[PDB]
Amino acid sequence: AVGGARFDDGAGGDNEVQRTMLELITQLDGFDPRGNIKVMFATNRPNTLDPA
């Protein structure tokens, strides 16, 4: 959660979590230099993790 699941699904909903989530996806996705950066992700369940 936070940079994990969207809270858009709710009735009033929220998208401060979509901002955080989005930013991370784009840094990973496409060209962008890296200095041998390993990416480790700890999720209790893959289900909760955004499918994106």
């Binding site: 858009d8 909903g13 998208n15 901002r19 989005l22 930013e23 996705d29």
Partner: protein, 186 residues
């Protein structure tokens, strides 16, 4: 193959043939939206196409340029719009639209409205037959069902492209692209 052929009708051909468009008088394509599954190379296409059209390629994301507060940033975005139109010809690639889509009734009247409105303005101004040919617009989004309802009214994005599932042919070619990097094993 198919999507490339389609994008090239919407984009490349009008760019060079712009005189012809003026004469006949019909609008030239006012932007293409690509949507459906990721991994289909929405990215990629736009880069190659822009280069052919020799038109400055901005890779851009409308909520990413909101830095901290939506006070100092709503205003930043009005500048970004201004900059991007100027120094044409150009193809501005605006990406993921989901955070500012907000089809809901609890759609923010905050500064999130301002980014969104200036999205409508960009597209409206391209209509005509001279403004469409210089300034070109690509847009990328994944879910297409969460958008603003004023976007499904009129022809705000003048062309809508759904990605199809890959074929056998499509898979076999993508593998070849990857395998070349590796040692060739027959």
């Amino acid at each position: 193959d198919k999507q490339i052929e389609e994008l090239v009708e919407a984009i490349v051909l009008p760019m060079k043939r712009a005189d012809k468009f003026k004469d006949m008088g019909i609008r030239a394509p006012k932007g293409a939206l690509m949507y459906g599954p990721p991994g289909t190379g929405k990215t990629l296409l736009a880069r190659a196409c822009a280069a052919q059209t020799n038109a400055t390629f901005l890779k851009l994301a409308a909520p990413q340029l909101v830095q901290m507060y939506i006070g100092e940033g709503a205003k930043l975005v009005r500048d970004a719009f201004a900059l991007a139109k100027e120094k044409a010809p150009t193809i501005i690639f605006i990406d993921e639209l989901d955070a500012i889509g907000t089809k809901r009734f609890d759609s923010e009247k905050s500064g999130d409205r301002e980014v969104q409105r200036t999205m409508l303005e960009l597209l409206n101004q391209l209509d005509g037959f001279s403004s469409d040919d210089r300034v070109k617009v690509l847009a990328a989004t994944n879910r297409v069902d969460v958008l603003d309802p004023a976007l499904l009214r009129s022809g705000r994005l003048d062309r809508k492209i759904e990605f199809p599932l890959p074929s056998e042919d499509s898979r076999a070619q993508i593998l070849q692209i990857h395998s070349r990097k590796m040692t060739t094993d027959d």
